[PDB]
Amino acid sequence: TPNQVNDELNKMQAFIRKEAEEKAKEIQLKADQEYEIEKTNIVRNETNNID
Amino acid sequence: QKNGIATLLQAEKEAHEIVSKARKYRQDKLKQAKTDAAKEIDSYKIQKDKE
Amino acid sequence: GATKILMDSTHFNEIRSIIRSRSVAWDALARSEELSEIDASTAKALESILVKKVNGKTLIPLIHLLSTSDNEDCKKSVQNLIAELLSSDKYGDDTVKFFQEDPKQLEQLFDVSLKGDFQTVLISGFNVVSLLVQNGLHNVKLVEKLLKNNNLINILQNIEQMDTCYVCIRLLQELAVIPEYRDVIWLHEKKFMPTLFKILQRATDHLGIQLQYHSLLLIWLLTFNPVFANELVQKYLSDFLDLLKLVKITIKEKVSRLCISIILQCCSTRVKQHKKVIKQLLLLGNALPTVQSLSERKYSDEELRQDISNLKEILENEYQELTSFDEYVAELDSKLLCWSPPHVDNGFWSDNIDEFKKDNYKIFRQLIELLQAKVRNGDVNAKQEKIIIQVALNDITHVVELLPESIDVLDKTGGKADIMELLNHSDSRVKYEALKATQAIIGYT
C-alpha cells in the first residue's frame, strides 16, 4: 500500500540524509587535517627561511 | 509514486548540494590555511626583525 | 535549534519513541505531593505543550525533580522530556542558551545522569552528550565524569543489546566530534578498543552495519591526530590488519573507505616511523594482493577511489624497497652497474618479478635498451662496460627464465641477433654468460 510506499520514500530520504551527514563530517575532518598539514608545511618552510 | 520520485530527485539534489558544500569547505580550508600562513609569515618577519 | 545531532539512526528514534510513550501523570504527583507543586504543574503543562511561551522557567524547576527523585519513572520521564526538548524545533537553541547561561547548571545534571537502570542511563546520557559538545560550552570535567561512569561502562560494553551499544557508540563519536575534547577519549580509548576489535571480528562472517561504520568513523576521527595515530598500530596489530580484509568483503563503501583512510592515516608520512607499519602490514598481512585487487575493483565515491589509489601508491612506494628494486633501477638509469646479488638471488628477482613487465614490458625494454645501445653503438669491451654488459646478460637471462613471454620482444628488439653475436667476446666469462643466455633461449623455442 501507499503508506508503505511513503515509508519507503522517507526511508530513502533518510539514507540519503545519512550519506550527506557522513559526507559533511568527513568534509570537516578532512578540512581539519588539511588545515593542520598546510599549517605545518608553511611553518616548516617559514622556519627554514627564517633560520 | 510521484512524491517518492520527487523525493529521490530532491535526494540527488541534496547529494549534489552536499558535494558543493564539501567543495566550499575545501576552499574555506585553503583560505584559512592561507590566512594562518600569512599570520605565521608576519610573525616570522617580526621575529627576524626582533632578532 | 543549534547543532542537534544523532537524528540519523532509526534506533535512537525508536528508543525516543519508546521512552516518550510512557504514561505518567504530573497532576497525580502534584495531588499526592510527591514533588514541588509548581514544578509538577509546569511539567504537566509542558507535557501538553510538547505532545500537542519561552523556556528557562521550568529549567530551575526540573532540577528539583532531577537532583532528588523518589520514583524512577519520574526521573526517566524528566530526562526523556529534557532530551526531547533538546532536539525540539520549537525551543531548540533557547534551551541551549539556558545551558549556555550557567555552565555549573549542567554539572549537577551530568552528575545525576547515567545512574541505576540502563533505561534511565540512556536519555540523561544523550542530553548530557548533546550539551557537552553543543556549541560554546566545553569542559573536560563532564568528559572525565562520563568516561569514569560505571553505569555507561556496561552499557557500552554490552554485546547483547545492539540498541544500547549503538547508542553508547554514537554518543562516544558525538562527544568525539570535537578533537580538543577527544584527548581524554584518546586516554580512555583502551576501553573502546575492545568493542572496536569486537566489531571488527563481528564484521568478518538492515541498518546493523551503521554501528561499525560509526565506530570506524570514530577511529578515523582519532586518526586525525597524528599523536593518537602514532600509538594506533602500536597498540593492537591484530585488529589493524583486519581492516582492509574485512573492508573488501564489506558491501557498502562507507566503512570500507573509512578503514582505508584510517589505515592510510596510520601509514601516513605525517606519522613518525609509519613506514614499518605499512611494511609489516604488506608483509605478514598480505596487503599487496589486497591493494592490487582493490585497484582492480570499482568505487562509486570519488574520495574512496582517490584514497584507494593513494593507499596503493603509498604501499607500492615502500614495497619496491625491501629487497630494493630501486637499487637496480639506479644502475639502469645511470647506465652503470656494479656487483650485487640482485639477479643472483632468486628471492630478490622474485620480488621485482611482477614489476618486470607493466606496459609492453617497458622495464624489460629499458633493461635491453642499455645492451642494445652497447651493441649498435660503442661495443668496446674494457673493464666496467664488459662486466656491466655481462651482469645485464645474466640478469636478462634470469628474467627470460622467469618470463617465458619475454622472448617475443627480444626478437623484435634486435636482441636475438645481438645475443648470438655475443658468443665470441674478448672475455671468456662474457662468452660464458652469452652462451648461458644462448642455452636459455634454446630452452624455449
Curated annotation (Swiss-Prot), chain A:
Coiled-coil regions listed: 7-37
Domain of life: Eukaryota
Subcellular localization(s) per the UniProt record: Vacuole membrane
Region (Interaction with VMA5): 1-12
Region: Interaction with VMA10, residue numbers: 11-30
Signal peptide range in chain numbering: none
General remark: Present with 16134 molecules/cell in log phase SD medium.
Quaternary organization: Homodimer. V-ATPase is a heteromultimeric enzyme composed of a peripheral catalytic V1 complex (components A to H) attached to an integral membrane V0 proton pore complex (components: a, c, c', c'', d, e, f and VOA1). Interacts with VMA5; the interaction is direct. Interacts with VMA10; the interaction is direct. Interacts with RAV1 and RAV2 components of the RAVE complex, which are essential for the stability and assembly of V-ATPase.
Function: Subunit of the V1 complex of vacuolar(H+)-ATPase (V-ATPase), a multisubunit enzyme composed of a peripheral complex (V1) that hydrolyzes ATP and a membrane integral complex (V0) that translocates protons. V-ATPase is responsible for acidifying and maintaining the pH of intracellular compartments.
Membership in a protein family: Belongs to the V-ATPase E subunit family.
UniProt protein name: V-type proton ATPase subunit E
Gene (name only): VMA4
Shown segment, full-protein numbering: 9 to 59 of 233
From Swiss-Prot, chain B:
Domain of life: Eukaryota
Compartment(s) where it occurs, according to its Swiss-Prot or TrEMBL record: Vacuole membrane
Gene Ontology MF terms in the entry: ATP hydrolysis activity; proton-transporting ATPase activity, rotational mechanism
Gene Ontology cellular component annotations, sorted alphabetically: fungal-type vacuole membrane; Golgi membrane; proton-transporting V-type ATPase complex; vacuolar proton-transporting V-type ATPase complex; vacuolar proton-transporting V-type ATPase, V1 domain
Primary location class: membrane
Keywords: Acetylation, Hydrogen ion transport, Ion transport, Membrane, Transport, Vacuole
Gene Ontology annotations of biological process type: endosomal lumen acidification; Golgi lumen acidification; proton transmembrane transport; vacuolar acidification
Chain's role: Subunit of the V1 complex of vacuolar(H+)-ATPase (V-ATPase), a multisubunit enzyme composed of a peripheral complex (V1) that hydrolyzes ATP and a membrane integral complex (V0) that translocates protons. V-ATPase is responsible for acidifying and maintaining the pH of intracellular compartments.
Subunit-level organization: V-ATPase is a heteromultimeric enzyme composed of a peripheral catalytic V1 complex (components A to H) attached to an integral membrane V0 proton pore complex (components: a, c, c', c'', d, e, f and VOA1).
Family designation: Belongs to the V-ATPase G subunit family.
Note: Present with 2280 molecules/cell in log phase SD medium.
Protein name per its UniProtKB record: V-type proton ATPase subunit G
Residues of the full protein shown: 3 to 53 of 114
UniProtKB/Swiss-Prot annotation, chain C:
Keywords per UniProt: Hydrogen ion transport, Ion transport, Membrane, Transport, Vacuole
Compartments in which it is found: Vacuole membrane
Membrane topology value: Peripheral membrane protein
An annotated GO cellular component: proton-transporting V-type ATPase complex
InterPro entries the record matches: ARM-like (IPR011989), ARM-type_fold (IPR016024), ATPase_V1-cplx_hsu (IPR004908), ATPase_V1-cplx_hsu_C (IPR011987), ATPase_V1-cplx_hsu_C_sf (IPR038497)
MF (Gene Ontology): proton-transporting ATPase activity, rotational mechanism
Keyword Cytoplasm among UniProt keywords: no
GO BP, sorted A to Z: endosomal lumen acidification; Golgi lumen acidification; proton transmembrane transport; vacuolar acidification
Gene ablation phenotype (knockout): Increases the ATPase activity of membrane-detached V-ATPase V1. Abolishes growth at pH 7.5 and in the presence of calcium chloride, abrogates growth at pH 5.0.
Domain of life of the native organism: Eukaryota
Complex formation: V-ATPase is a heteromultimeric enzyme composed of a peripheral catalytic V1 complex (components A to H) attached to an integral membrane V0 proton pore complex (components: a, c, c', c'', d, e, f and VOA1). Interacts with YND1.
Note: Present with 22500 molecules/cell in log phase SD medium.
Family statement drawn from the similarity comment of this UniProt entry: Belongs to the V-ATPase H subunit family.
Task performed by this protein: Subunit of the V1 complex of vacuolar(H+)-ATPase (V-ATPase), a multisubunit enzyme composed of a peripheral complex (V1) that hydrolyzes ATP and a membrane integral complex (V0) that translocates protons. V-ATPase is responsible for acidifying and maintaining the pH of intracellular compartments. This subunit is essential for activity, but not assembly, of the enzyme complex. This subunit is also required for silencing the ATPase activity of V-ATPase when V1 is detached from V0.
Protein name: V-type proton ATPase subunit H
Species for this entry: Saccharomyces cerevisiae (strain ATCC 204508 / S288c)
Species classification: Eukaryota, Fungi, Dikarya, Ascomycota, Saccharomycotina
Gene name in the database record: VMA13
